[PDB]
């Protein structure tokens, strides 16, 4: 599993030396982040608002349907066994036809509420079935589809009529300003980075990767040549080190 | 109109929506897509597009050696949006239809008040001033049965139509997150 | 009015057949009929768990037909205007949201969208992070709903022969509400099928939990429970009633 | 008074048209209000040309 997260960091452009050189740090930032889920669950009852609303909106629509039986609908009494015991079958069929017309309209109102509400849950189950496949069983490059930040992995948890994910996301925290430049003249050639950008702490230039400050000496293994200096807007001067040169110097 | 058909105002005014689409717009321009991940990180915009070209497999020497060309192909492409908007009124057909299909369904609901539904007159104050309360309760029970069916028809049209907009807002909320705040590798999801 | 009737015309009507203008049958002038001022009354309140104090929103009137604050949604009475801008707590409409704060009362305010933050942009300045954090967010989705089924005969005409014979005259209104509530209740077993049952086999953890130093014991199942559910699954099963 | 005989047909059409009108403030909430702060442009617009 220490080699799984090094795949997961490669999926977000962070070179896997960030993982192994900080494995005890990420183990304590991951375990302490699980430990804050419980204190975000064992105290705040409003965390489960999307799932308690599914239970509430159906116990509401049944307890509205049951209370429709106590309505007269124009008839003399809402109790059907009180019309049959107090009226004659020529007259009683007028009163009962007002209740059947009234109650059957109350079912068609209820079923139409259920077809539309179950078309909302199916659109929220196919969203959950997409987040199960693309975000648990893989790693998603879709921004803010799997929690705010660069996504690493998810862990599903069951829930009463629903699913709860634990999106484990990578979020960059502590920054520094840097004077950058898109290009470097060395001998008139314009060296561009293979992976990352050029920065400078103020005196010397370094190529580093995009999402974690890891400065490296600018060599020809980091940079590739294209064209010459006269075209790129913002090119700076620097020496670009050559690894092959001190080999053949000795 | 006066028949209890109020229109509630939206929560977010049109000035506040034009502050989110400046905050979503000044973060895309100045900070790349890192304002969607964590804190916004400034980056020169000529170096943002070199990330964006690396996302589509084009080596970033294409950008810097053709930066004045892309600046004139991008500015002239914004300039054709206005001439595609300031003349063709049928460009906004998906949004004018949302306004039309709701002013249609209210002006069908209001015109249901002029129907007799079997009763002698569609004016309820003309039954009460012309009939006796044993007989008038027969006529009014035809209007209440008729008008309440016209509301349940209207609300059922609104629940189904608002389930179409929510499926088109969650598509817009997906294109806001995956396509403004990042770069999408999904073909023909973003133009 | 300025509605110039013709000298044979008596009533002016609306779209909805109600009379909009009449002609006075003694002094022949033309009179509009505007119905009297009306509007919805909404009661903005915090919970009665907190307080019993309310503030009343008269929807879509002015503050004449009735501390007294004016919105674009109507005349808000009972809530104090505050120049400060907070996050939205009880949404009113047209940018105003109300809340219960501190000596305590209900305040109303133009809501705030977030803290203003100008990015220190320039044409050669990049801001690369030096350190990170691993945040575990939680996303909670509904999957299924309650599989109900309504007996269309026992609901309408419960234990009555004289009513069930009248129900047969309406035809198949009964035998399609049992079909529509079955077509829901089938796919509620398909929604739970598609979300969870994607793995073809049932994998299980090795007995030694040396996952690089990480600690998954708060999400893996607990064998000491009678239903072998995790610790976080047991917190979720007690927060939903 | 005749409408009260039908029961809660009134008090569920006001609930169904509120359950729409709440999420119309949630649709605009989910689409636009995704950014946590309000960023604004620098006063000098040298965005690469």
Of A27, A38, A158, the CB nearest to C212: A27
- CA-closest candidate to residue D39, choices C152, B181, C84: B181
What is the rounded CA–CA span in Å between residue B75 and residue A232?
A: 20
What is the rounded CA–CA span in Å between residue B74 and residue B142?
A: 65
What is the rounded CA–CA span in Å between residue A57 and residue D12?
A: 12
What is the rounded CA–CA span in Å between residue A96 and residue B75?
A: 74
- CA-closest candidate to residue A5, choices A118, A152, A128: A152
Supply the DSSP symbol for C36: P
Show the tokens assigned to B26: 């000044």
Burial of A188 (0-12, 13-18, 19+ CB in 10 A): exposed
Burial of A93 (0-12, 13-18, 19+ CB in 10 A): middle
What is the rounded CA–CA span in Å between residue B140 and residue B124?
A: 7
Which of C:81-120 have CB within 8 Å of A? 120
CB contact under 8 A, C118 and D42: yes
Which residues from B are below 8 Å from C126, CB to CB?
41-44, 47
From A3's Cα to the closest Cα of chain B, the distance in A is 24
CB contact under 8 A, C133 and A234: no
Q: Give the dihedral of Cα atoms C44, C47, C51, C53; nearest 10 deg.
A: 10
Show the tokens assigned to C52: 């019993």
Q: How far is CA A35 from the centre of its chain?
A: 20
Which residues sit opposite A225 in a β-bridge? Answer: A191
Show the tokens assigned to C144: 């299924």
What is the rounded CA–CA span in Å between residue A33 and residue B138?
A: 68
Show the tokens assigned to B8: 């509630």
What is the rounded CA–CA span in Å between residue C78 and residue C54?
A: 7
Of B44, B64, B184, the CB nearest to A180: B44
| Residue A190 phi, psi dihedral angles, 5° rounding | -110, 100
Q: What is the CA radius of gyration of chain B?
A: 27
- CA-closest candidate to residue A81, choices C151, C159, C167: C159
What is the rounded CA–CA span in Å between residue A32 and residue A190?
A: 46
CB contact under 8 A, D25 and B173: no
Q: Give the dihedral of Cα atoms C182, C186, C191, C193; nearest 10 deg.
A: 170
| Residue B13 phi, psi dihedral angles, 5° rounding | -70, 165
Classified as helix, coil or strand, A153 is strand
C-alpha dist (Å) from residue C173 to B25, B121, C151, C200: 54, 31, 12, 42
CB contact under 8 A, C122 and D39: no
From D28's Cα to the closest Cα of chain A, the distance in A is 17
Q: How far is CA B71 from the centre of its chain?
A: 32
CB contact under 8 A, B111 and C15: yes
Residue C212 zone, left/alpha/beta (φ > 0; ψ -120 to 50; rest):
left
Which residues lie closer than 8 Å to A227 by C-beta, 6 or more apart?
A189, A190, B61, B65
What is the rounded CA–CA span in Å between residue B17 and residue B23?
A: 10
- CA-closest candidate to residue C113, choices D36, A117, D10: D36
Experimental determination approach used: cryo-EM
Burial of C168 (0-12, 13-18, 19+ CB in 10 A): exposed
C-alpha dist (Å) from residue A201 to A22, A190, A206: 23, 21, 8
- CA-closest candidate to residue A119, choices C142, C68, C39, B20: C142
B59 and B49 Cβ atoms separated by less than 8 Å: no
Strands A184-185 and A190-193: antiparallel
Of A160, A161, A212, the CB nearest to C132: A212
CB contact under 8 A, A182 and B44: yes
């Amino acid at each position: 599993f220490a080699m799984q997260m090094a795949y997961r960091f490669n999926g977000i452009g962070v070179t896997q030396n960030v993982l192994y050189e900080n494995q005890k740090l990420i183990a304590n930032q991951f375990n302490s982040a699980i430990g804050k889920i419980q204190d975000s669950l064992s105290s705040t009852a409003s965390a489960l608002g999307k799932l308690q609303d599914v239970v509430n909106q159906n116990a509401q629509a049944l307890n509205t349907l049951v209370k429709q039986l106590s309505s007269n609908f124009g008839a003399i009494s809402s109790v059907l066994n009180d019309i049959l015991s107090r009226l004659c079958p020529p007259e009683a069929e007028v009163q009962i036809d007002r209740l059947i017309t009234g109650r059957l309209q109350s079912l068609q109102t209820y079923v139409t509420q259920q077809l539309i509400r179950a078309a909302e849950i199916r659109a929220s189950a196919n969203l959950a079935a997409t987040k199960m496949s693309e975000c648990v069983l893989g790693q998603s490059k879709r921004v803010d589809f799997c929690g705010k930040g660069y996504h690493l992995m998810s862990f599903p948890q069951s829930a009463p009529h629903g699913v709860v994910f634990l999106h484990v996301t990578y979020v960059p925290a502590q920054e520094k300003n840097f004077t950058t430049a898109p290009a470097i003249c060395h001998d008139g050639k314009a060296h561009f980075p293979r992976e990352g950008v050029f920065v400078s702490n103020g005196t010397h230039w370094f190529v580093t990767q995009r999402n974690f400050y890891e400065p490296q000496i600018i060599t020809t293994d980091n940079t590739f040549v294209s064209g010459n200096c006269d075209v790129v807007i913002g090119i700076v001067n620097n020496t670009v080190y050559d690894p092959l040169q001190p080999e053949l110097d000795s | 109109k006066f028949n209890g058909l109020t229109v509630l105002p939206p929560l977010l005014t049109d000035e506040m929506i034009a502050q989110y689409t400046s905050a979503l717009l000044a973060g895309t321009i100045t900070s790349g897509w890192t304002f969607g991940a964590g804190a916004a990180l400034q980056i020169p915009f000529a170096m943002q597009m070199a990330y964006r070209f690396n996302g589509i497999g084009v080596t970033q020497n294409v950008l810097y050696e053709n930066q004045k060309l892309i600046a004139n192909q991008f500015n002239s492409a914004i300039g054709k949006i206005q001439d595609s908007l300031s003349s063709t009124a049928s460009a906004l057909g998906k949004l004018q239809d949302v306004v039309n299909q709701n002013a249609q369904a209210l002006n069908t609901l209001v015109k249901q008040l002029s129907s007799n539904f079997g009763a002698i007159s569609s004016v309820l104050n003309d039954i009460l001033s012309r009939l006796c309360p044993p007989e008038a309760e027969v006529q009014i029970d035809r209007l209440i049965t008729g008008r309440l069916q016209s509301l349940q028809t209207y609300v059922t049209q609104q629940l189904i139509r608002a389930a179409e907009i929510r499926a088109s807002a969650n598509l817009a909320a997906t294109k806001m997150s995956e396509c403004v705040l990042g770069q999408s590798k999904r073909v023909d999801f973003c133009g | 009015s300025n509605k110039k009737f013709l000298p044979f015309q008596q009533f002016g009507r609306d779209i909805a057949d109600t009379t909009d203008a009449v002609r006075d049958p003694q002094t022949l002038e033309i009179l509009d009929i505007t119905p009297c001022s009306f509007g919805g009354v909404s009661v903005i309140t915090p919970g009665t768990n907190t307080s019993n104090q309310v503030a009343v929103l008269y929807q879509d009137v002015n503050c004449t037909e009735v501390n007294v604050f004016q919105t674009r949604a109507g005349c808000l009475i009972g809530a104090e205007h505050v120049n400060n801008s907070y996050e939205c707590d009880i949404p009113i409409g047209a940018g105003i949201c109300a809340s219960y704060q501190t000596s305590q009362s209900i305040i109303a305010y133009t809501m705030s969208l977030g803290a203003e933050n100008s990015v220190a942009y320039s044409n050669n300045s990049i801001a690369i992070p030096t350190n990170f954090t691993i945040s575990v967010t939680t996303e909670i989705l509904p999957v299924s709903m309650t599989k109900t089924s309504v007996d269309c005969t026992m609901y309408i005409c419960g234990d009555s022969t004289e009513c069930s014979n009248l129900l047969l005259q309406y035809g198949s209104f009964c035998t399609q509400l049992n079909r529509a509530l079955t077509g829901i209740a089938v796919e509620q077993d398909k929604n739970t099928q598609e979300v969870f049952a994607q793995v073809k086999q049932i994998y299980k953890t090795p007995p030694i939990k040396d996952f690089g130093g990480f600690n998954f014991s708060q999400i893996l199942p607990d064998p000491s429970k009678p239903s072998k559910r995790s610790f976080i699954e047991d917190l979720l099963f007690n927060k939903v009633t």
